[model samples]
Target chain A: ESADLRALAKHLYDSYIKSFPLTKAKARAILTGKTTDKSPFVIYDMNSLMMGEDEVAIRIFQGCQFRSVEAVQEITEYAKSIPGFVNLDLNDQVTLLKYGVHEIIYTMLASLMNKDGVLISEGQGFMTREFLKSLRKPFGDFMEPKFEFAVKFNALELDDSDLAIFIAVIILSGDRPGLLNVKPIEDIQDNLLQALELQLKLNHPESSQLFAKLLQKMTDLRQIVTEHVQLLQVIKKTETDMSLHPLLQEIY
Target chain B: ESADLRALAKHLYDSYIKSFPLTKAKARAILTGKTTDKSPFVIYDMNSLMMGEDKIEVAIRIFQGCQFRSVEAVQEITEYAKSIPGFVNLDLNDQVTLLKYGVHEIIYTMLASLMNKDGVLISEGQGFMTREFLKSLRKPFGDFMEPKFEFAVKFNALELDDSDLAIFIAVIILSGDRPGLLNVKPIEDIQDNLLQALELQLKLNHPESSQLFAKLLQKMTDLRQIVTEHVQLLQVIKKTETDMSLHPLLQEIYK
Candidate 1:
């Protein structure tokens, strides 16, 4: 009898990956891939007529901003619950979690994105790509690459279940420099990376490269976060419009 | 005559072959060997990180948030390049230029240390990243990485030990054909000794494959184009998308 690894994949997804709020989850397909769900209740955003362009820009910015802490708590919940995460040395746990949380959040953001724009604020507010480009220079083009990454990443068609495995892979990365004990973390990621591969092979057999392509995105995620954080640092220094999320300050 | 050749071979073995910080056995045991394999143990240098959590909480911020080993690879390769016999003798500008263009090529070559044909070992060889995944990512990334894997797999076919790799890397670095060379003659001479040294070693060690030496030189030629494509793609992503902050070291030479 063959080993059924998908059992682990299924467990990882149901237990940890399915944590996204129903708001983002339900609307995810409407904007994502080719589903274009035709529900009458769901509406596209940005009909504001009275507010100045800056007001609308700032409005969307702040909304995506608060979701920042929401993500910190959300990912923390998952990280703690992952099977062996809590058993690591206290310092290793903190080091891995602190560095890993944002990459998890960014990968989670892929659920909210469509090629035209991304959904913000419980999927009630949709921020168009052009609107993201219209803000002040630093803020203006900020989410563009993320949108580019998300749209392409979404095309891979990973469900929240698949992303659960993917997100786990991101956190358990052994390559992060400050890790005091990588063998433990990397060992965990080994199983997660394998589970993700098995899930894709069984789930998407036609897409032969799906597993490796997803791993390569781990490479891309670093660049995206690198650019994003530096921009936020510039924003933190110059504009009073936004401030650092506590978790971000703790990590960055 | 035979004595002179053996002496040089032995010297090359000690200088290049035995110079690796980690043994091939240890790295293979950690990365390619199965966790449950009798070789199930690995080590990470925890000695340097002894400070309490308070000290390390911000130590990572020094990276400015980029992750996943490119910086480490860059740092590791830069030091190795400087250690090569005559690399430091080149013009300072030439050293920077060679490494700037050549470092990525070297980094990709070193992936062999962590990979086998089935998959590449990642996260200090703790995790196995399958080739299928590289082929799976979105375009350019998937396309770029999987092909590199193909080369690494074939490169692995050589089964050249660490000593073979040490000289291979030197050959890649000392090539005078790299663009913007101020001291191409000096660089060319450096390559002459390596090329001859490598050829003689191959003949003596693997006489079965008379063409192996030429084939690897061809692989080196093929690698330049691969490095060019890699550099071109990253630059395009930077120019069009969100601007990425390069590691100051990666920033200096790559530009």
Candidate 2:
């Protein structure tokens, strides 16, 4: 019934999206019973005056990019944890990661954006739309759309299993420009699309456009990554002294 | 060294943009097998009134539109690649490999640029099919245009100028991860410089430079998804259209 596969995908989504845990202060406070409703955990927004100066913006963008790298590493491991994913050859895995990570990062970001277009940072902080729009031009541009998409996507109200299957569809994508084994990749993606479609039918009986709409989101995710690459192109040219994590450099 | 690559990219850009033949009657008259415009051929626009009342009009229109765009894109990208400094340096097999794998994605990318709120301008100003009309077309044809139109209309929102498009085509051409690429580093270097030049140009040319630049890059993913669905359409055609004959290049690329 592909339920097992769906379950594995669900696990991947949970782990991959939440790979970066809450910070020490947040964790300690949670355990020690500091539950004041007045003071919510504040996620450092990238667009804040914290990044008003050029030097700080560069550092923050670099930091976010590196965090993206770590998240990608976690996503790779989770993909491997799935039964069919690891069965593919080592080169196929590398190729998928190389071409696919940007889309995955942004898709995960969409889920974190929640209904209000706010993102939780390591479970302790919140990233507001204003704060995101406040960052430098290209960098701020990157976060704004994801927030918009997130708000729209969350309106669909897909549960964790639905999201897990959707993420699987993203990972198994066969159109990553070049692939040593496209047929197999396409086959896996076909299987996943079918499974996801079926699950959506069963889980969301009343909504006719839900599956199609979710599929459309995959295209939206592509749009985000395309913008991301353009952003990277700007960073590479303008911030010549900026040191990107080697893994991020290779992919972008 | 990077400047040489930028120059090569600019040359490719110039050559690629001109590869599409104009369909105006006056322009058509210039192609009597005797001109310097070595493009040398034309694809018929599918919107003649003859096609106004057929049952399979939708299918034919979709097939013809995709086919014309596909063939023209191949030729344009092929010439564009040949002019690049690093592209010809690759093994000929790898060259074919890159173009074969990448052409459909590039075709959709170009199509996105040509599209507007109505539909893709199949013949520039003469053939503006509305999105609703395209969606009303038959089964796979309707499906095909919907996603492409969705992407195109959104992408058209960016308002990229010629210079932005030129660099984008270069980035698509010099993509580093195409499966059989024999020399990834050189292609990457060329792409890196193209990005730099593209960003510089965007900054100087546009007032709201950051959003425009980011928006352009974001369309790449949209392009990727469009092509993914396209390949799905190809598979559908392969399975369902037993009587249909595909172009040799389309067959090779689709295969």
Candidate 3:
């Protein structure tokens, strides 16, 4: 019985993990600068500051949010491959994705995170906690909680398989507001829930507490996204001239 | 193995249905106030008033957040506990202990019956209080109500009926895993049987859904978390550095 559940989960793992283009080892090497890309973007850094500190910080944050496209495009492809995802009523599909993508993005961000900072521009540059903090309110506030969530999330040491299932769980949730056929969605989620639990128990067996805390992390993403919207709202009001991706504006 | 589980569940259903006095119809009537006892107080009919009215209406909603469950609801739970397959065989004090801890979760689990997305039915269904109104209540009150509401809504989606609901509650109450048991063996055995019973019941009930049994089990686990947090977060209520109340039963369970 247990083997059957695990086999089903392993298939989900095999499929879901493909979305992550960079392996943890690969991501880490980039974070540690063990490897560097020959082709690099002209990313903004404080050294490139030509204006007021706050002005440049806003520009940097603008670039950061804008670059979310790269992760979004990749994760969305992975999202389509997720079993039962397309079977959902088309509106329900949008609802889950709308609430989910930012959370998914943050969940995956842990791979690129170290204690102090996150790798940016595909690791052509890294953004330090201090550098992020130096940005103004809401902007300054953004990365720390994500960093807080990421650092602890990293300690759980979920391999990509575990990560994939967690992401799938995030997308397939029944808890999101206004879901139509909530029952069908929950049915799909239950299969994955056990699968994820089995993987954690087998893979991270030493930390028996892993599964419970991981559920809380699922809750944690909401708080991060809640603030993400709040900060984005203020950004819209203050930086009215600045642009957001239409997809981003749709979810926001 | 599938045949075996369904047989156990079938047995549980036969025995359990006889043990309980009220069916879903009776309970729903009591909740809706169609019964003769008609001891009505006041509530916004938690179903229709599913969302909060407004900011000004919110302040007054503070008192609305506090509650007293219908006498029928508790009696039904007590009746269910006494009938759980091996429950009477459990040491008397252990029986008292489990029921004390068990009642709170069962109350919320059963809350799903009266609840839909509109909001929970309250005060004989005279009015439905909006969740936003509950959320509006300051401090401990807001924190306390929302999790239960969320869990109820999600549980509602499972579409488990009263028979299965009762069995699920039976499993929860007999969960020998609760802290402080004098003899764990019999209690655990009772829980294990019910676990199998409920698992099989889920399969027969929702055949389209795979792993429904484990999903229900996970929700049970989630319920414990909600209950535990409900307890601890209220300790902050106990923090009022202000006054409080205890009528004995509340103390043993809460303290």
Candidate 4:
């Protein structure tokens, strides 16, 4: 319900719309990044939406479809073992945090991909890109690339205060509507400005700056995850290696 | 004076008296397997006439003739650097306390060696053997041969707590009258038992054992003062093409 969370969700929704403009029933075919299903986004279920809070969550959920939990866990374990993380800089912290979040989403998707077809027929509202875009079209023009880009950056639609308000609203009432739900939309302009500020500030006197400038990459990679998680899996592909998922690795 | 301090000073005197019968200079000359000078034990002004409060006091006062100013400072420094005293099994702390008293005497000997007219002095103390007897000590059995062979070890005369007392008394008030010295006359007895015990227990294993060992060598070398001041000169001499002390070397029977 937060502006940031909503923007993130919208971003994901928009990405899903773009990547899968058409849809089909084959879950494995859809997850391999080669799925040609261009259908509108559909919520297979409402309860399964509140997703991952960590990288392990993302990786497990993303790779869960392969039925190779052991391989996913190993890969995730390997990623975790890479050194020099404990003393990361602020930018690196953000990078790692996004990676962690991305992995969590990936894990969830992996699970959704592996589920039986019958599970979707009962009360489970599945999403396709076309359906979600239709819902988004009633609110505003969803074709703007900048809006699309913001979603890719995974910038949340809420500020710190907005997050508090959204949580309060969600806690106080069963359904999302009114001030808290709308406040997430207000965060776009400020976040764009922040991205601009970050661009200018981060252009340091180093090779990293040159690379960043050339790539035109924003420092905060997480800002795009909301857009992509729903519509596009830009950053990570489903790792077939079962060892890379957190849960499987941790249990063993 | 502390009783331990007095005990150490008298111990040094008793050892010194015992040392006269079985001499280190004789042992060293014998061990080195060389001709040694046979001079009478010339007891320098090594009398009680020059002592201060205790052994540390007396030795430091004597070493003042060289340069060390404070015994307490020197003892602290030595205690830290010389791990023997720091690591030795016996109560090294109390040993250090007594050593604070012993160091002054050791330093004074070092100072006296420095002040020798020809950078060398004949052993003449009532506590030391004459240079003549030291020379006559046969090699391995000959004159000047006592400290050679098995007898050569890290033994000190003024070593024990009581030996320190004797040193202080002889240095200040002659304890020769007190009859408070360990008097062993036989050379073999001193070597086989007493001397070896002193070497094992006190000389080799004392807290400041290495320092005391170096002190003995410094006394014999007589040129330690020159070496300490002009290390480069020593290095030069050592690296020189020819034996610089050839004349002295030729004087030795073995040489």
Top-DockQ candidate index: 3
Residue B5's lDDT in candidate 3:
57
CAPRI docking class of candidate 1: incorrect
lDDT of 1 by residue, B1-255 (tens): 345534545665565433444435556776543546423222122222232222213223212332236677776667777766778988998988888778778777877666677666544444444666446545345455655776787777777776667777777777765568886877866676666667677767787754456446545534655666677776765654454466677676665
Instruction: State the weakest 10-residue window (summed lDDT) of model 3 chain B.
Output: B51-60
Summing lDDT over every window of 10 consecutive residues in candidate 1 chain A, give the lowest-scoring window.
A45-54
How close to the true structure is residue A153 of candidate 3, measured as C-alpha lDDT?
79
Clashing residue pairs in candidate 3 are B44-B127, B44-B128, B45-B127, B45-B128, B45-B129, B46-B128, B46-B129, B47-B128, B49-B130, B50-B130
In model 4, the runs with Cα more than 4 Å from the true position are A1-252, B19-120, B123-227, B242-255
Model 2, A208-233: lDDT tens per residue? 53554465466666666766676677
Clashes of 1: 11
What tens digits encode model 4's per-residue C-alpha lDDT throughout A56-139? 334323443343344344333322322222233434333433344343333223223322221122113243333223333222
- lDDT per residue (tens digit) for residues B12-75 in model 2: 5566556544322222223233446432222223353345324124467457666876776688
CA lDDT of every candidate: 0.64, 0.62, 0.67, 0.30
Docking class of 2: incorrect
What DockQ, on C-alphas, does every prediction get?
A: 0.01, 0.06, 0.07, 0.01
TM-score of each: 0.51, 0.47, 0.57, 0.16
Top TM-score prediction, candidate number: 3
Question: Can you tell me which runs of candidate 3 are displaced by over 4 Å?
Answer: A1-18, A30-45, A48-54, A242-252, B1-255
Compute the DockQ of candidate 3. Answer: 0.07
Q: How close is candidate 2 to the true structure, as a TM-score?
A: 0.47
